[PDB]
Design a protein around this ligand. Structure first.
Ligand SMILES: [Mg+2]
Ligand SMILES: [Mg+2]
Ligand SMILES: [Mg+2]
Ligand SMILES: [Mg+2]
Ligand SMILES: [Mg+2]
Ligand SMILES: [Mg+2]
Ligand SMILES: [Mg+2]
Ligand SMILES: [Mg+2]
Ligand SMILES: [Mg+2]
Ligand SMILES: [Mg+2]
Ligand SMILES: [Mg+2]
Ligand SMILES: [Mg+2]
Ligand SMILES: [Mg+2]
Ligand SMILES: [Mg+2]
Ligand SMILES: [Mg+2]
Ligand SMILES: [Mg+2]
Ligand SMILES: [Mg+2]
Ligand SMILES: [Mg+2]
Ligand SMILES: [Mg+2]
Ligand SMILES: [Mg+2]
Ligand SMILES: [Mg+2]
Ligand SMILES: [Mg+2]
Ligand SMILES: [Mg+2]
Ligand SMILES: [Mg+2]
Ligand SMILES: [Mg+2]
Lengths: 95, 98, 40, 32, 53, 151, 69, 131, 94, 110
RNA sequence: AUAAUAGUAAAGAUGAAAUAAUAAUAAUAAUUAUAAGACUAAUAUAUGUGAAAAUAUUAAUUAAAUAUUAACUGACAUUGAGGGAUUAAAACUAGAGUAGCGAAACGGAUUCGAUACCCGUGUAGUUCUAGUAGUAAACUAUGAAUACAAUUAUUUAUAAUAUAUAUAUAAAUAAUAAAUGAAAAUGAAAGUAUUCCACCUGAAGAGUACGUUAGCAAUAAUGAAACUCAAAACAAUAGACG
C-alpha cells in the first residue's frame, strides 16, 4: 500500500529487462555443452578476432587492403563451393 | 567575456526573488532555474552553482565579497559540494583546490 | 489551447487504449470501399 | 620507373637534403 | 508475324494517347538506333503456351 | 533503520592475459532492512537492487603458487590457480549460495580454467553455478592502440 | 543439406516492401536483425536488397541514437 | 516542415507515470501552438524500460514513459523546442525528425505508416467505418 | 524472390581440393574403451557390468591394438573436378 | 528563351550566394556558384549575338552592364576582396607590390 | 587519472630479464563515484557520392545532384595556352586543449659493436578556431569530348503485357570475339576515326648551379651549361637461389 514494497515484486523483472545478450544458464546435469555453446557464440560475434586486432593499430590503407583481401577470399571460396556442388551433381547424373 | 551593452544580469545572494516565488508553480516546479542558474553574468552562491561551472569573483565567507579570479581572463571551476560540512571545493586558477 | 487540453485529456486518460507494441497484432478494406464509393 | 632509378633518385635527394642542412649557417650569413 | 524495323512516326498517330496528351515530337526511344534488333535472334512465342501452362 | 547486511550470491571473475592469469572471488552483499525503512523512492530501491554491492573475498594470480616471471602465462600455471580457487572456495565453503562466473579475455588460461572447472576437481563445484557470462571487453571507438611490433 | 529458411522469407516484413526507416520507432522489428549484443547481421544472413539493408542499418543506428536499443 | 519527435520523459512518480508526461506535453505543445505551429497528433508508446541505465538530471534512470508528438513549425521554432527539451531535466532523451511533405501534405506518424494505414485520413476513415 | 546472387570465378588453372575429407570409420575398439571407462567411472573400476566391456576390449585388442583396420578409401572428387571443369565452368568461347 | 533562363539563374545566384555568405567554409557550393554565374554569362553573350535589344533590356533589368558579361570572371579572391563579399581581406599583397602601390600613390596636384 | 569497498604478495613486458610501479597505503585484479582527450562496432561493399584531395555514430538548417513525360529555346557546343579555385600527410604563425599514440632525448635490452629493430619515461606533433604554404607511389603509373563495332553472366532503374513475374531499353561490374600491342595485357578501350590541351627525344651531371618570382620559415615554381661514356631501359623465356 506504499512504496518500496511493490518494488521487491518488480526488481527481478527490472533485472532481466536489462540484458546484454551474453546471459547464459548452464545445465545442472552436464556443463560441457554450456561452455561449448558459449565458445561458439563467442565466435559468431567475432569478438575474439576483433579483440586480437584491437591490441595494435593499423594504417587506414592497410585495413582497407586487408578488408578487400578477406572479402575476395570469401567470395572465391563460395564460388568454389558452388562449382564443387555442380560437379558432384553432374557426376551422379552420369556425366 | 561576452557582456555587451544591452544584456540583463541579476544577483541572487539574498535568494530567489518574489517574482519566482509566486511563479514557483511554473518556475521551481519544472526546475527551469537551470535556465538562469547557469547564465553568464549573474552571481549565485556556490551552493546553487552546478558542479563543473566556470565561475569568477569567488569569496571565502558567506558575508564576504568576492576575492578570487578577478583579473583579466581569469576563471575558476567548481568541483564538489559538501552540505554536511558547509564547504565546497573550488578549483582555482593557480590550480589549487581550496 | 482548448483543443490541446481536450486532445491531451483523451490521449492520456487511463481508459484510452495504449499500444505498448509488446506483441504483434493479428488483426485495408474501408479505404478502398470509400474510394470506390466516391469514384463510381 | 622501376625501383632501380627510384633508389638512385632517393639517394640523390637524401644527399641534397644533408648538404643543404650542413650549409644552413653559410646560407644565413650570405642572405643576411 | 510481328514486323521488325518499323517505327511509328508521330504523324501516323494523330489521336491523344491513354493519358490525353497529343504526341507532337519524337521521344528518346525514337532517337536511338535499332540495328541490334534486326540482327538479334527473334524470340518465338505462341498463344498455345499460355493455355498449356 | 539499522543496517542489516547479508550475502546472497557469489561472483568468480577470471582474467586471462598473454602473460598472467587473475582469478577473483567476491560475494554479493545486500541489506533487507534497507527497504523496511521509508524515506526512499522507487528509483532508489531499483538502483540499489540493479547494482548489487560486492566485496572481494579471495584474490590471487598464478604468482601466488610458486610460478615466477615467464611461467605466469602457461596452461599448467592457470590450471593450478583455477584448482586453487576451487579448493579455496571449498575450504571457505561459500558454496552455500550459488556462484555466478563472469569471464574475460583469452590469454592462454581460459582453456585451463574451464578444464579445471569441468574437471573432477571442480566436478563438485559446478553444482553451485547456474549462470555464466563473458565480459571480454572491446572498443567501439578508438584510443589509438600502440603501433606494429616489427619483430 | 537443402534445409531452406523460407519461413523467414514469408515472415520478414522487411522484404515485403515496407520502408525500413519507418520502423526506427519499433525496436522489436529491428531487434530480429541484430545479434545477441546488437551487431547488425551481414547482407548474406539478412538477405535483403542492398537498398533495403542500407535503410535497415540506418533505422537501427538511429534507433540506438534515440536510445531504444 | 512537418516534424516528429520521440520523447522519453522521466518517471519519478511511479504512481502516476502519465502525470509528468501530461505536464511536459502540455507545456511544449503550448510552446508550439502559440508559436505559429500546428500539432498533428499525440499518442503514447507507454511505460517501457530503457535498454541500459542512463544517468540524467542526477538520476540513473532505468525506465521512461515514451510518447509521440507530430507537429508542424518553422525550422527556428523546432530547433528551439529541441533546445528546451534537452535543457529541461524532465525528459532524459529526445530526438526530432522531419517527415517529407513534397509528395503528400498529410502524413501519419512513423508508428502508423509502419502499419497498413498511411495517413490521418485513413485513420479517421477506419475509425468511422468500424464504428 | 530476391535470393542472394550467384558469384562465378575467373578462369582457373585447375579445380581441386587440397586435402579432401574422405569418409572413414573409427575402429570402435577405442569406442569400446570409451564405454568401459564410462562404466568404470560410474559403476566402479572393473565393476561387474564393466567386465562385459572388459571382455569386449580383450576381443578387439587380442590381434591388433586398434583391431582389424580396413575400409580405408580415398575421395576421387579431384578426378571428377579435373575431368569436367572444362565443361562446367561456363567460360566464353574462343 | 535566353532572357527567361538568365532571370531564373539570377534568382538561383542570389539565393545560393546568400547561402555562401552565411557559410564561408563550404567550397563545393562556391564552385557551383561560379559555374552558374559563368553559365549566365554564356547565355547572355548569345543573347547579345542574337537579339541585342532584349540583351540590353534584360541586363539592365537584372542590374548588370555589358562589361560584367563580356569580360572574364573567375570568382577570384580579389573579386571578393574588392566587392566586400564578406568584409575582410583574404589576399595579401607582398611588400613589393604593396610598395609599388604605395609609390604609385602619387597624390598628384593635377 | 583520482577516491572508496573489500582483498592479498607480488604486478608489467619479453623468445627471457632489467629499466618504470609493490607488504612506507598494502599493490595487481574485482565493484562502485568523478573528470578529461581522442575516436566511431557490426552494417561494409568506400557500396555509393564528390572535380580531385576526400567521404560511413545519430538528428536538424542551407546548397547540389537521377530517370520519364510536356513545353520552351535554338548550335547558345567541345577543348582550353595564360589565368582562377580546391588540394592528403608532414611543416610553420597566434589562441585553447593534451586522455591515448608518439619524431627527438634519456634509460633498459640483443650483439664484438647496435647511433635500430624489443621494453620504460615520454617533449614537439597528433585536437578545435583563424591563417601560410600548394606539395605525394596527389596511381586507373591510363587528360577531356564525340560517332561506331560481336557475345555471355550478375545487379540497379524505367515501361504495363500480365493472371500472381515474364518481356524490351539504359548504367555498373566480371569473362571474352575482332582489333591493338615489344609482349604482360586493354577489351565502351590501351579497338576503328575526329577535335582540343599538356609532355618526350641516350645515361650521368640534374630537377643540380645561377637568376627571378612568392612565403614568417621549411621551401614551391621556372631552370641551364661544362667534364665522362657506349651505354642505359621495358616485356617475356630458361636456370640458380630463398
Ligand atoms: Mg616513366
Ligand atoms: Mg637551392
Ligand atoms: Mg651581410
Ligand atoms: Mg608467454
Ligand atoms: Mg558553358
Ligand atoms: Mg585496477
Ligand atoms: Mg563502422
Ligand atoms: Mg566504386
Ligand atoms: Mg575526372
Ligand atoms: Mg538560324
Ligand atoms: Mg573547360
Ligand atoms: Mg590552366
Ligand atoms: Mg586519409
Ligand atoms: Mg601551436
Ligand atoms: Mg604509449
Ligand atoms: Mg620507444
Ligand atoms: Mg590556400
Ligand atoms: Mg609533382
Ligand atoms: Mg584475340
Ligand atoms: Mg594504333
Ligand atoms: Mg606503348
Ligand atoms: Mg625545386
Ligand atoms: Mg668499351
Ligand atoms: Mg622485368
Ligand atoms: Mg632450382
Amino acid at each position: 500500500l506504499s512504496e518500496a514494497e511493490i518494488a521487491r515484486s518488480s526488481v527481478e523483472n527490472a533485472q532481466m529487462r536489462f540484458n546484454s545478450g551474453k546471459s547464459i544458464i548452464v545445465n545442472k546435469n552436464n556443463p560441457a555443452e554450456s561452455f561449448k555453446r558459449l565458445n561458439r557464440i563467442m565466435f559468431e560475434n567475432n569478438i575474439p578476432g576483433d579483440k586480437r586486432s584491437q591490441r595494435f593499430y593499423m594504417k587506414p590503407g592497410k585495413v582497407a587492403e586487408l578488408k578487400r583481401s578477406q572479402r575476395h577470399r570469401k567470395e572465391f571460396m563460395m564460388g568454389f563451393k558452388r562449382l564443387i556442388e555442380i560437379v558432384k551433381d553432374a557426376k551422379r547424373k552420369g556425366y | 567575456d561576452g557582456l555587451r551593452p544591452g544584456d540583463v544580469v541579476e544577483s541572487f545572494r539574498r535568494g530567489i526573488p518574489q517574482t519566482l516565488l509566486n511563479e514557483m508553480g511554473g518556475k521551481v516546479d519544472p526546475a527551469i532555474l537551470s535556465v538562469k542558474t547557469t547564465q553568464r553574468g549573474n552571481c549565485l552562491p556556490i551552493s546553487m552553482i552546478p558542479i563543473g561551472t566556470i565561475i569568477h569573483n569567488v569569496g571565502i565567507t558567506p558575508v564576504g565579497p568576492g576575492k578570487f579570479c578577478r583579473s583579466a581572463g581569469t576563471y575558476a571551476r567548481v568541483l564538489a559540494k559538501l552540505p554536511e560540512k558547509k564547504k565546497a571545493i573550488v578549483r582555482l586558477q593557480s590550480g589549487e583546490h581550496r | 489551447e482548448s483543443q490541446l487540453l481536450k486532445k491531451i485529456d483523451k490521449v492520456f486518460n487511463d481508459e484510452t487504449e495504449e499500444f505498448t507494441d509488446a506483441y504483434d497484432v493479428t488483426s485495408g478494406n474501408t479505404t478502398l470501399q470509400t474510394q470506390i464509393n466516391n469514384a463510381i | 620507373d622501376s625501383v632501380m632509378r627510384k633508389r638512385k633518385k632517393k639517394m640523390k635527394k637524401h644527399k641534397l637534403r644533408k648538404r643543404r642542412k650542413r650549409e644552413k649557417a653559410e646560407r644565413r650569413k650570405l642572405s643576411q | 508475324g510481328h514486323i521488325i524495323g518499323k517505327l511509328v512516326d508521330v504523324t501516323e498517330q494523330p489521336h491523344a494517347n491513354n493519358k490525353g496528351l497529343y504526341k507532337t515530337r519524337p521521344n528518346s526511344s525514337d532517337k536511338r538506333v535499332g540495328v541490334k534488333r534486326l540482327y538479334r535472334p527473334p524470340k518465338l512465342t505462341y498463344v498455345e503456351d499460355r493455355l498449356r501452362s | 533503520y539499522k543496517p542489516k547486511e547479508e550475502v546472497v550470491k557469489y561472483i568468480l571473475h577470471g582474467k586471462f592475459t598473454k602473460n598472467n592469469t587473475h582469478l577473483t572471488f567476491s560475494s554479493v552483499v545486500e541489506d533487507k532492512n534497507f527497504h523496511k525503512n521509508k524515506g526512499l523512492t522507487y528509483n532508489d530501491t531499483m538502483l540499489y537492487y540493479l547494482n548489487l554491492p560486492q566485496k572481494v573475498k579471495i584474490s590471487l594470480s598464478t604468482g601466488c603458487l610458486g610460478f615466477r616471471k615467464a611461467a605466469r602465462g602457461e596452461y599448467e600455471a592457470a590450471f593450478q590457480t583455477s584448482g586453487r580457487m576451487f579448493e579455496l572456495i571449498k575450504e571457505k565453503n561459500m558454496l552455500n549460495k550459488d556462484i555466478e562466473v563472469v569471464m574475460d579475455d583469452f590469454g592462454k588460461g581460459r582453456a585451463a580454467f574451464i578444464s579445471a572447472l569441468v574437471g573432477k576437481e571442480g566436478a563438485s563445484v559446478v553444482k553451485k553455478v547456474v549462470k555464466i557470462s563473458d565480459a571480454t571487453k572491446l572498443k567501439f571507438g578508438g584510443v589509438r592502440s600502440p603501433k606494429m611490433r616489427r619483430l | 543439406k537443402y534445409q531452406a529458411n523460407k519461413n523467414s522469407n514469408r515472415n520478414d516484413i522487411m522484404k515485403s516492401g515496407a520502408n525500413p526507416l519507418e520502423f526506427y520507432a519499433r525496436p522489436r522489428i529491428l531487434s530480429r536483425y541484430v545479434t545477441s549484443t546488437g551487431r547488425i547481421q551481414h547482407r548474406d544472413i539478412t538477405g535483403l536488397s542492398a537498398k533495403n539493408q542500407r535503410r535497415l542499418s540506418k533505422a537501427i543506428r538511429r534507433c540506438q541514437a534515440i536510445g531504444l536499443m | 516542415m512537418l516534424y516528429e519527435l520521440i520523447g522519453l520523459v522521466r518517471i519519478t512518480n511511479s504512481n502516476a507515470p502519465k502525470l509528468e508526461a501530461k505536464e511536459l506535453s502540455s507545456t511544449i505543445g503550448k510552446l508550439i501552438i502559440q508559436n505559429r505551429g500546428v500539432v498533428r497528433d499525440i499518442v503514447p508508446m507507454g511505460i517501457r524500460y530503457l535498454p541500459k541505465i542512463m544517468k540524467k538530471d542526477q538520476e540513473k534512470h532505468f525506465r521512461a514513459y515514451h510518447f509521440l508528438m507530430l507537429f508542424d513549425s518553422s525550422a527556428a521554432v523546432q530547433s528551439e523546442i529541441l533546445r528546451t527539451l534537452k535543457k529541461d531535466p524532465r525528459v532524459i532523451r529526445s530526438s526530432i525528425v522531419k517527415v517529407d511533405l513534397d509528395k503528400q501534405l498529410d502524413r501519419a506518424s512513423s508508428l502508423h505508416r509502419s502499419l497498413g494505414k498511411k495517413s490521418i485520413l485513413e485513420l479517421v476513415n477506419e475509425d468511422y467505418q468500424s464504428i | 524472390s530476391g535470393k542472394p546472387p550467384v558469384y562465378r570465378l575467373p578462369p582457373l588453372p585447375r579445380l581441386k581440393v587440397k586435402k579432401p575429407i574422405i569418409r572413414q570409420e573409427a575402429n570402435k575398439c577405442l569406442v569400446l574403451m570409451s564405454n568401459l571407462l564410462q562404466c568404470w567411472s560410474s559403476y566402479g573400476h572393473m565393476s561387474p557390468k564393466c567386465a562385459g566391456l572388459v571382455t569386449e576390449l580383450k576381443s578387439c585388442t587380442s590381434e591388433s591394438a586398434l583391431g582389424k583396420r580396413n575400409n580405408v578409401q580415398k575421395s576421387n572428387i579431384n578426378y571428377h573436378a579435373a575431368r569436367l571443369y572444362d565443361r562446367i565452368n561456363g567460360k566464353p568461347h574462343d | 528563351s535566353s532572357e527567361v533562363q538568365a532571370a531564373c539563374m539570377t534568382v538561383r545566384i542570389q539565393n545560393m550566394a546568400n547561402h555562401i555568405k552565411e557559410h564561408r567554409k563550404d567550397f563545393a557550393n562556391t564552385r557551383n556558384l561560379r559555374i552558374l554565374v559563368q553559365q549566365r554569362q554564356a547565355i547572355l553573350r548569345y543573347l547579345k549575338r542574337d537579339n541585342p535589344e532584349k540583351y540590353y533590356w534584360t541586363i539592365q533589368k537584372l542590374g548588370l552592364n555589358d562589361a560584367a558579361i563580356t569580360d572574364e570572371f573567375n570568382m577570384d579572391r580579389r573579386y571578393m576582396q574588392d566587392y566586400e563579399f564578406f568584409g575582410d581581406k583574404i589576399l595579401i599583397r607582398d611588400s613589393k607590390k604593396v610598395a609599388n602601390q604605395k609609390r604609385k600613390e602619387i597624390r598628384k596636384q593635377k
